[PDB]
Amino acid sequence: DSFINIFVSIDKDGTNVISYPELEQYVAENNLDPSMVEKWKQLFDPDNTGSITLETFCSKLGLKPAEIIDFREQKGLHAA
Ligand SMILES: [Ca+2]
């Protein structure tokens, strides 16, 4: 899946802030390497703010927030 998709999957409450527990739950539930947590923090929370915003995620990856929002609206609709 795309980074757009994975962001929406991790951010299960839709706040457009990935909390560290959200990230950690995704890693464990998908049997990923726990080092993944540190990599996301380093790439997407470089200033160590304590969470990962949609804004910083998008700036690092060259995405716009509008792309995650579209996907979120489509996922919701599709799911229904
Ligand atoms: Ca969240």
Residue numbers in the entry: 2 to 81
Task: Provide excerpts from the study.
Tegumental protein of 20.8 kDa from Clonorchis sinensis elicits IgA immune responses in the host and does not cause an IgG response. For this reason, we named the 20.8-kDa tegumental protein from Clonorchis sinensis as CsTAL3. The interesting thing is that similar results were reported for SmTAL2 and FhCaBP2, 40. Both proteins belong to the TAL protein family of the class of fluke proteins that consist of a calmodulin like domain (or N-terminal domain) and a DLC-like domain (or C-terminal domain) as in CsTAL3. In this work, we determined 2.6 Å crystal structure of the DLC-like domain (amino acid [aa] positions 83–177) and 1.3 Å crystal structure of the calmodulin like domain (aa positions 1–81) of CsTAL3.
Due to cleavage of the full-length protein, we had grown a crystal of the calmodulin like domain (aa 1–81) of CsTAL3. The initial phase determination and model building were carried out by the SAD method with an anomalous signal of one selenomethionine. The structure of the calmodulin like domain is composed of five α-helices. The α1 to α4 helices are classical EF-hand motifs where two helix-loop-helix structures and two short antiparallel β-sheets (β1 and β2) are connecting the Ca2+-binding loops. Ca2+-binding motif 1 (CB1, residues 12–23) is a Ca2+-binding loop that contains 12 partially conserved residues starting with N-terminal aspartate and ending with C-terminal glutamate as in the EF-hand motif of other calmodulin like proteins. Other residues bind a Ca2+ ion via their side chain carboxyl groups, but V18 (–Y position) binds to a Ca2+ ion via its main-chain carbonyl oxygen atom. Moreover, CB2 structure appears to be similar to that of CB1, but a Ca2+ ion is absent in our structure. A significant difference is that the –Z position of CB1. The molecule shows structural similarities with the calmodulin like domain of a family of soluble Ca2+ sensor Kv-channel-interacting proteins (KChIPs) and of the short Ca2+-binding mitochondrial carrier (SCaMC) with r.m.s. deviation 1.8 Å and 2.8 Å, when 60 Cα and 62 Cα atoms are aligned, and DALI server Z-scores 8.2 and 8.146, respectively.
